[PDB]
């Protein structure tokens, strides 16, 4: 099952309260670390 | 809902014979069109089918003003045991003609 999309989360919450989280998630999706 | 037992018998017999049921959702209709010469008001049909649905015996759909009801396997067993029908009797739906 495909539950969470980091790209959508960042693009939607980049200016919200949960920005610092989603950015931190997006890097994990990109750099593999 | 309170109703004479013969109305329930007629409704269940029609449902098991055909396998499906259709109603117009009109509590003031004097009698169901299909159940003619038996004097069954439409409200009795609606409430009986609602009681059957609550127990899972029939599946329900609603379209534009009408109730459509289909008979489930457990509903088939319940009607067969209720009407004391022989195990050799099946609704017309289950016959691939």
């Amino acid at each position: 099952e495909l539950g969470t999309d980091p790209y959508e989360d960042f693009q939607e919450n980049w200016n919200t309260k949960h920005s610092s989280g989603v950015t931190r998630e997006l890097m994990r999706e990109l750099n593999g670390g | 809902m309170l109703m004479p037992k013969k109305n329930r018998i007629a409704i269940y017999e029609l449902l098991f014979k055909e396998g499906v049921m259709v109603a117009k959702k009109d509590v003031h209709m004097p009698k169901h069109p299909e159940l003619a010469d038996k004097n069954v008001p439409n409200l009795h049909v609606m409430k009986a089918m609602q009681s059957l649905k609550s127990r899972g015996y029939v599946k329900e759909q609603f379209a534009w003003r009408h109730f459509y009801w289909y008979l489930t396997n457990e509903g088939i067993q319940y009607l067969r045991d209720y009407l004391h029908l022989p195990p050799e009797i099946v609704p017309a739906t289950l016959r691939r003609s």
Binding site: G3, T4, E8, N13 | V20, Q61
Partner: protein
């Protein structure tokens, strides 16, 4: 007695509309695409177009045998005049209704909105459409509602060619916190045959043929045969 032609045509239209609504509500899960009623004095045939016919038919044909029953019960015309058939759509990617239903059921399963929209867009474009647009509106995130827009390819908006070059579909999906709305537009490709696209071209597209090679004449030659 009989009714006038105006009432007759209006009644036929209303019957078709109600039949389509009922079939939509019944067979949304099966990728219901459309209904086609062919009236013959012997029997009135109804063709049901859906992505998969196995669920519509049911086991041993039970479910369809139910539908042709209730229809006969609903509209009241006599038994033996009803017969339903299920036919799969030629191409499911070029149908806006089927794609809207697919997106709705992907969202209902818990899939991410953006991922599902992009998957539907990619499938539509791979099917061969000129372009596609998908709009999702509602309470996607938070108490404040918004709208996401995904576009690709070409798209026309105004004029008469919109009628036969654009396929549109609007759907609703009920999620835990309210209703989400889905709009899908697909621009059909031009096809000389009428199978998967409009036969006529766009009004403003002019195709000038390349002239053929001609041998330059040098000396008068008379040929008798």
């Amino acid at each position: 007695v009989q009714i006038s032609k105006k009432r007759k045509f209006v009644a036929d239209g209303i019957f078709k509309a109600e039949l389509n609504e009922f079939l939509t509500r019944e067979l949304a899960e099966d990728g219901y695409s459309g209904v086609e009623v062919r009236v013959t004095p012997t029997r009135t045939e109804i063709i049901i177009l859906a992505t998969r016919t196995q669920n519509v038919l049911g086991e041993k044909g039970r479910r369809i045998r139910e539908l042709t029953a209730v229809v006969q019960k609903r509209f009241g015309f006599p038994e033996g005049s009803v017969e339903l058939y299920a036919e799969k759509v030629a191409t499911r990617g070029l149908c806006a209704i089927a794609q809207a239903e697919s997106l709705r059921y992907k969202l209902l399963g818990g899939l991410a909105v953006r991922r599902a929209c992009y998957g539907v867009l990619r499938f539509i474009m791979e099917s061969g459409a000129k372009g596609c647009e998908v709009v999702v509106s509602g309470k996607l995130r938070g108490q404040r509602a918004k709208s996401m827009k995904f576009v690709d390819g070409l798209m026309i908006h105004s004029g008469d060619p919109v009628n036969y070059y654009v396929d549109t579909a609007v759907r609703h999906v009920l999620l835990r916190q309210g209703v989400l709305g889905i709009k899908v537009k697909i621009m059909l490709p031009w096809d000389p045959t009428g199978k998967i696209g409009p036969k006529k071209p766009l009004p403003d597209h002019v195709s000038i043929v390349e002239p053929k090679d001609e041998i330059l004449p040098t000396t008068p030659i008379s040929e008798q045969k």
